[PDB]
């Protein structure tokens, strides 16, 4: 697909940041190496459900004033294409496949089959969690349902699973044409308190490590690489300075389009014609 | 000022950037917000859910 690393990072960082900040012992583990008073002050101010201060995330160049006490500024950077395929053919498909998804589901009995229902039509099934079927189990997929023979499996009549699968758009042939790009995004934790900037740096590094395992950047946005700048005053001529430490996140990812092929051939036919010269 | 309002900010109240002495205008996508539906305490803004 076409991709937007900045919007991915914003969408991914915001919930993760919230879920760490609402959970005190996580911060208590992340900041174990800092000075005791720095740790306790940060945990008192920003952390837990009762926290009176709050962190914020957003892109650069807003028209309004931000929460300069603690704010992650996201800032789309450079990139370059790095590796190309022969013919620019990144892949080919017989059935137009969408995004990868993971969904929780439960088995149910139906007509002496077990079935799992999924919210969308299954274009491909990658894994039913914790199950490997035998041929006897007569595994079949149909529409948005996975179906599974009941006879030997009655104990599992309410078994709970996670389905990893991917959508289908439509039944069509084509070529995925495109290339790989290596692209940079900068993130900086602004604070007018230097110890807050240092803690926001630690929290961001933890978040990015945790992010490396996510499906989003396992399937796309691969090879996350981190670089770190000096701590410096971002703005120097207010009633106080504003500090931050930049980090650069670099990703390798595919830019591509679905070139559908309308041509289809369904029968050869043969004829002999005679040359009398 | 402008703020996006979410469940946390409803429950906890928006901490305002400025030390508001008084409000001269307040509005949302649905129109003006009437004074029975907002309150300021301790420089926090509380809104009707």
């Amino acid at each position: 697909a076409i991709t937007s690393v900045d919007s991915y990072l914003l969408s991914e960082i915001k919930p993760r940041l919230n879920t760490v900040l609402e959970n005190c012992y996580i911060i208590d583990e992340v900041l174990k190496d800092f000075d005791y008073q720095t740790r306790e002050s940060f945990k008192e101010a920003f952390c837990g459900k009762n926290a009176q201060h709050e962190v914020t995330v957003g892109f650069n160049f807003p028209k309004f004033k931000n929460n300069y006490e603690a704010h992650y500024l996201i800032q789309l950077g450079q990139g370059q294409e790095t590796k190309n395929s022969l013919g620019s053919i990144q892949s080919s498909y017989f059935e137009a496949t969408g995004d990868t998804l993971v969904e929780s589901s439960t088995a149910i009995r139906e007509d002496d089959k077990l079935v799992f229902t999924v919210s969308k039509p299954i274009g491909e099934l990658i894994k039913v969690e914790d199950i490997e079927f035998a041929k006897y189990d007569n595994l079949q997929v149909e529409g948005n349902k996975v179906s599974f023979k009941y006879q030997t499996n009655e104990d599992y009549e309410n078994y709970n699973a996670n389905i990893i699968f991917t959508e289908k758009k439509n039944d069509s042939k084509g070529l995925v044409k495109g290339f790989t790009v290596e692209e940079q995004v900068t993130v900086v934790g602004l604070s007018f308190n230097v110890d807050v900037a240092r803690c926001l740096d630690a929290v961001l590094k933890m978040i990015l490590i945790s992010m490396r395992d996510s499906i989003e950047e396992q399937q796309t946005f691969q090879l996350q690489n981190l670089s770190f700048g000096d701590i410096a005053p971002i703005i120097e001529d207010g009633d106080s300075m504003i500090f931050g430490r930049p980090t650069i996140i670099k990703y390798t990812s595919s830019l591509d389009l679905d070139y559908t092929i309308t041509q289809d051939i369904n029968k050869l036919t043969f004829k002999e014609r005679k040359d009398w010269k | 000022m402008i703020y996006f309002v979410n469940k946390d900010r409803i429950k906890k109240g928006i901490p305002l950037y400025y030390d508001v002495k008084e409000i001269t205008y307040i509005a949302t996508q649905d129109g003006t917000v009437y004074e029975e539906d907002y309150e300021i305490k301790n420089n926090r803004l509380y809104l009707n859910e």
Partner: peptide, 12 residues
């Protein structure tokens, strides 16, 4: 210089 960056309550 004006107190924009860090903003504190009025004394009363």
């Amino acid at each position: 210089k004006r107190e924009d960056v860090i903003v504190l309550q009025d004394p009363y």
